[model samples]
Every structure is written in C-alpha cells, then in structure tokens.
Target: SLRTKGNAELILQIDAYLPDTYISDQRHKIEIYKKIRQIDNRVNYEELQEELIDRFGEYPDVVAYLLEIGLVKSYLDKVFVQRVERKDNKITIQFEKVTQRLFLAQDYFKALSVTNLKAGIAENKGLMELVFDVQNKKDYEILEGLLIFGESLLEIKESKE
Candidate 1:
C-alpha cells in the first residue's frame, strides 16, 4: 500500500521551454519527471518505493553500485532503496524516489555541449557528486544548467502526471 503527498494538481510547466526533441525515448523522460513531482508532492516514501518497484522492477545492483561508489548509503537521510529483483542472471535496480532528481541533474550536466570545463568538472566530481567551487565558475555554470534542466523536467512530468 503506497501513499503519495503533494498536490498532483499543481502542474509543472517547465519542460515546455526545452522540449524533448533530442531524447529518443519519451517514456524515460516522463517517468523521471513523474517521480520528481511525486517527491514534491511528498507522497508516502514507502508507498512510492513500492509503486516504483511495481513499475520498474527492482534495482539491487544499482543500490549496490551507488553504495560501493559512495553515491548513497545503505541507510542514509533523504535516500533509500526502492526495490530489488533477481531475474535470471541479471539484477534490476530501482533506487528511492529522491535519487531520480540526482540522476536527472547528473544527466542534464553531462549533456552540455561545452568541452574542457565540462570534462574537468566531470572528472573531479562525477555528475551528482559535484560541488560548486567558486574558482571553477565556468564548470559550475554547466553543472547548474544541468540541475535546472532536471527541475524543469520534473515540472513537465508533474503537469502530465
């Protein structure tokens, strides 16, 4: 039994500014945004996790990778494991509802066309792990742009959901 908070009626109209002309898969984009909107709605964390599992199966390996790589802790604040499923030889990983935003921010940053600065930032912080160093203003800009894009996508997903 999963419960969700937040006003789903409050639409997110940010994505219209940057349409999904590039992403080949619209469903992926939709899911990402919807997840964020749900989080904003403050839906039941446990229920959200269950729904995510029902929709995307389990993500045990993903959780392990995040933990091993220090992206998240096994039991950390604002982070959690959504689901874990073993199918045949492969493992499907679905992290908590909040991680979607982090992933969105990461992807948005990596997608920037700028070079040199982008590469440097990527090397140092690895997307979601990045911290703003005032010395690297150019790099920080790119990273910030990515987070904005992710948030916009969240709005788009919320509106539709």
Candidate 2:
C-alpha cells in the first residue's frame, strides 16, 4: 500500500542482528543495513538488489538472506502488525489493541477458519497476540509459515488507519 491501505513496520525482528560473513568491512555492513532498513516496497527492494549486485559484485548467502529479511519487513509493513516474535514453539503477531478487539468481536472466526492458529491476550502483559504454533522448525520453515499466514491475512482487511 506504500501507505494506501494496511501498513506496519518491522515485525520481522528475527532479523535484527549482524552477520559475520563475506561482509567483513564494518563500514560496508553499516551501509548495507541502512538500505535494508530503508526498505518498504517493491521500489526499495529493487534498489537494494541493484545496490548489492552492482557494488558488491556477487555477494554471499548471508547477503541474499539479508535481502530476504528486507522483503519480509516489507511484507510486515503491508500488514497491520504492531510486533512479531518467534519463540521455541510459537510465532506471535501482535496487533493494535482496538484491532484485536475488532477481530475478536467480529471477524475472529474468519481468521480461525483460514488457519487454526492460537489467539489470546498475553496475560499480565496487557496486550493481544495471535499465536501460531510451530514445531522445531528451521529458520526458512518458520519464515515460510509466517509469509503464508501473512498472505492469508491480506485477503481480509486489518488496519493502518
């Protein structure tokens, strides 16, 4: 939506760390991270891809995965998520308190009908989080699951306004 409809931020915080791979230059890594954080849409992705390819002259899997992280962040921005987290056996998506109540009061079952994920208020924490149960999933598997869930959410409107 680039700000047209639903929108959000980096709920894909699983990628909030530094890489110690081919990008050994500290200054270079910072520059790359700046671009990644600047990501928000197809244009951002295109520019990041071009920058990585043209400047780095063929990067590593780590760089590719870094780019993948930016794309996921873009996905998060399109959705209306306030936050996202992955624990041992659960990936939780937090929405605005009002939106959470709206879903619970109205379209909760629609979401349930699509995916049999857990939804609950994080007790004592004073917030709502949709929990997607997971196995001992690898990183890519978890990312795959989240992207699929996000795709389903897009079919229905959420928030941003």
Candidate 3:
C-alpha cells in the first residue's frame, strides 16, 4: 500500500543525515537515500543497520528515528490513516473514515491498555479520529503504541474478510 508517487518527498524528510557538501558525504547521503527508498513492511532493520555501518560508519539517533518513522508511515498508510501528530501530551491520529471494519475492532485497541486512547468521529465526515494522551511516555513509546494500534486495524480487517 506504499504510495509510490509521494515517496521522493518522504525520502527527503527521512534522510536524517546532514548536508552533502563534501564529496564523500554526498555519496553516503545518496546511498542512504537509496536504501531508504527501498524500505517496506518486509525491510530488515538489523541487516540494514549492518549494511549502513559497512558503508558509512555508525549512524546517529536521528537516523534511527527516521527509520522507525518510515516503518510507521508504511503501516499507517496501509490502514488508511492520514496523519499522526503530537501536541503537548496528546497524540491524535486522523483516519480516512470510521468504517465497520474499525468499529468491530475496538476490542483489540482496548487490550492495548493505553487507557488514554479513544476513537471518535471527526468534524469532517470523510475522516475519523483516534486521540490519546502520552503524558509520561517517550517519543518512541508513543510512536510504537500508535503503530501497534494501526497494525491491529489491518489485522482485524483481514480477519473480517
């Protein structure tokens, strides 16, 4: 379900490395960009890490975060989730719609024990909302929780079929 059209822009955002001013640095950036462009649900992060190290020394935290974002984006896109944003203690997920598939999948979300997560209709009829409070969690924890919730919807939808 990866949208092939908008990936170039996404790739730019996810390539966390710095300016490619130097020749060697530019090469490294190009390689990293190429590697990122190939990422999908089946991507192997451990192997990719090894390859990245083999080419360009140890990567940074931002690079790691970018990789996680890429994977999360892929899952979100699959589930028709439009966006996930954080503001203060809240994480809000906007979806394309609240379908019967999702309404029946509430049990899976409730089991996440994230207590704060809740779903509702968006003001716009074309979209739905999933809002949660991540008051004390780290950024990665929030992203992981959201990713799990999104993936669960896909599983539920598959089971329904």
Candidate 4:
C-alpha cells in the first residue's frame, strides 16, 4: 500500500546499520524515503545499502546496471536538471516522467529478446512500439518538451539556480 513508510524506514534502517557512512547527500536519500514512506517501510535497508556499496566498488558493473535499471527507474520520477551556465550559473529542468514508459519499453524489449530475436531487432521493435504509443496526447506533451529543452545550450556567464 502507498501508505506504508518504506523510504523512511529504509533510511532509518540504513542509518542504523552504517552510522558512520551516512552523510549529507544522504539527506536527499532520506527525503526520497520520507516522500514514499507510506509504502513498504519494512524494506531491508541494510541489504540495499550493502548492494549499492558493493556496486560502488565496481563502477563499471554499477554503471551498466544503472543504465539498464536505475535509469529506467529514474525516468519514472525523474526531474532532469540541466545547468545552462557554469560561470554565471543557470539551471533548467528539461524532462520529467513517471517511469511508466520506460517500464513498458523494458518489458516489451525483454519479451522480444526472449523470443530469440536478434538484440538489435528486438530493440528496434521495442522502439517502434514506443513510437506508436506516443500517439497519445500525454506522450506528445513529453515529446515536445524533450525536443525543445533537450537541445538547450547553456551559457557560462548567466546567473544560475
């Protein structure tokens, strides 16, 4: 149920297991946890932390997994932030999605792959499916933003947030 405090509990559990490791940026983690605290508060935080920590030691594997899974997960609740300026520093939010599309894409691609199709073929098939799905109004809205903001060029001298 969404009412369970999963993220909060996970944060509490992780802090308990690795008191020395939790730092400031972990605050964001905690923030995320709290926001979703109503779901699965009993999740094994230690196990999750251990898994992430282990993967951190092997960045390549971690990166690959993140691209395959984490990226998809991020797509669901992602607020893509772009820094348009470095010197005068400006920031812009470009894309946001609820992760639903990525999940659907992943499942579709996996199914095709499982059917013994060539990897590229399966991926293209999945892409075609995603393209077709984009005929929806909501999808068009997302696509428009991606087209416009995705190509933004940032300046270094403007004041940024």
Candidate 5:
C-alpha cells in the first residue's frame, strides 16, 4: 500500500527525461507503473536499483531513499505494526494487538537488544521502544536505526519458524 504510493511519487518526481507531452503517453506511464509494482511485490533492492539506473540513468538520493522506505514499510506491514515514531533519541513502534505471536518470544526481545541500542517492549500495549544517542546522527541515520530494528523483529519471527 505504502509502496504503491512511494513508487508513484518517485515516478512522477524522477521522470525528468520525458517531455511534457510524454505525460500523456500511457505506454510510457504503464512501463513505470509496472516497475513500481515490482517494488511493492518484493523485488530485490539491488535488482531494482540496477534496473532503474539502466532504464533512467542515475537516480538521485531521494529515489534510493524512497526505495528503502518502501522496503521498511513492507517489513512493518508484515508484522502488523500500526505506527513508528522517533522523538528525543527514542524510537517507538506500536502494533495492532498484544496477542500478536511475535511478542511471545524471548528471542524477539533478545534480537532487538543485541543491536547495541537499549530496547524495551510493552507487551501489554504491543509497543517496542529503543533508545539511541542521536546527538551526532543525521535524520537518515535515525530512520535507518528504526528500520533496522523492524528488520530484526522480522528476522526473529522467521527464526522461530
């Protein structure tokens, strides 16, 4: 869902080579549409990156970041996370229900803590919290940290199975 939105925005923003008249070219638009759909459908990041460059020259940093965001959203959606927020060097991710099975695993909590970030879980409310020293980190760094945390949770779930 978010991937579709991310890819659509990226296509419109980065379609710089096309002429204004080309906007009406449904054929060209459909080509881009399929590529974005591939992204949402879990196409490998390196493959998508290579394809984008091969098709459209070098993409800008924003394009790459959007793809990363799409991947993160995919992971979050898989685990039924309702929302993620970062504030004052703390990151909090919340899920739809405490009964979601991943929260039952000590391995999940262990995996989260091993990332060198202080981690805690509120199983009653289905929230995971992490603390990081963000004084020297950029905005992207903070975002990356949160995404990594989400990825770790996914890994833990997979390992259990």
Candidate 6:
C-alpha cells in the first residue's frame, strides 16, 4: 500500500482556544479535531459550523481561521498537494503527478501568470514545487490560489486520459 504520507490525505491540526465559558475545555474539542482530521465532505463544514454555533456561541476569529484552515486542507486533498508552505509573500506548494501533467496544459496556469503570480517550478531539495508571490494577499487568499487550481483541475477529463 503506497499509503505513505505523500498527499494521500488532508493534513492539519489546531490547538487554538475558545473561552471556557462558551465551550468548556472538553470533549467538544476532541470531536472537532476528529471531524477536522477526516473531513469527508463540503457539507461537513456547513454542518460543523451550525453545530458549533448551536452548542457554543458564534465563533471567535481564531476558531473561524481554524475552520478556514480545515476548509483549505480539504481543498488541498482534492488536488493532491503534498504540503503548502508560506513565508511572507511567497507560497510554496509541493504537489503530485498524473493529473499534474494534464493540469499543466490548462489555461489556469496562464491565468495565474496574468495575475502577476509565477505559477512555475522550483526545487525545494528535490521536492516538486510550484511558487507564487501573493504579496498583497490576505492570510487566507493563499488558500484561494490552490482552491482555484483545484477548481480548474476538476474540469479536466480523467477517465478519457
């Protein structure tokens, strides 16, 4: 089983806190972690959002970002990205094969270039890489770049290939 830790699943963890009065340091966090680690469907997030607000109160910004990270991880799994790392304005994405070759042919690559981002390659110690400069982007817009790539990826015909 090539079930090694090379992009086979979404990877993320959060240890952020919510007020004890609102959520109490309890099994709810354990349940949230369980839900996040194996996040199965898009609807799971909507349901989790509802459940959290129903049980606790409206999320603090930190919790919102945690869920956003979860959403981004879900997107990363969709496109089989190995790992996503960001530093200052640069976002480095490690990725996988097969659909990548097919992905390279799409206009999405050029569109990103037009947006003044380099959708090109770099070698992070021989790890496959794609680089983007999102200098003016918000913290989560980095997620947008990958999610958009995933959106384009879904448009390709895999069965015919």
Choose the strongest candidate by TM-score: 6
Candidate 4 backbone clash number: 15
TM-score of 3: 0.67
In order, the Cα lDDT scores of the candidates are 0.33, 0.59, 0.56, 0.26, 0.54, 0.59
Tens-digit per-residue lDDT, 17-84, candidate 3? 43333225665677766666556663555577777677656767667666676666666666666566
Poorly placed runs, candidate 4 (over 4 Å): 1-58, 77-161
Clashes of 6: 0
Report the C-alpha lDDT of model 6 over 1-161, residue by residue, as the tens digit.
Answer: 25322343433223344556656767877777777666554688788889888977698866776676666566556556667766666776666764355355333454354433457766566445667777777645655565566544444423234
Per-residue error for 73 in candidate 1, Å, reads 15
Candidate 4 vs candidate 5: the TM-score winner is 5
lDDT of 1 by residue, 32-69 (tens): 44543344322343455566456555535332222122
User: If scored against the real structure, what TM-score would every candidate get?
Assistant: 0.21, 0.64, 0.67, 0.17, 0.61, 0.70
Q: What is the lDDT of residue 7 in candidate 1?
A: 20
Instruction: Give stretches of model 2 more than 4 Å off.
Output: 1-21, 100-128, 158-161
- So what's the TM-score on candidate 5? 0.61
lDDT of 4 at 150: 24
* TM-score for candidate 4: 0.17
- Stretches off by above 4 angstroms in model 3 are 1-24, 44-46, 98-108, 111-127
lDDT of 4: 0.26
lDDT, residue 91, model 1? 23
Candidate 5 lDDT: 0.54
Cα deviation at 85, candidate 4, in Å, is 38
Candidate 5 local lDDT, 21-95, one digit each (tens): 323467865665455445543566568777767866676655556666666666666566666655665555566
| Better candidate number, 3 or 6, judged by lDDT | 6
Return whichever of 5 and 6 wins on TM-score: 6
Q: Which scores better on TM-score, 1 or 5?
A: 5
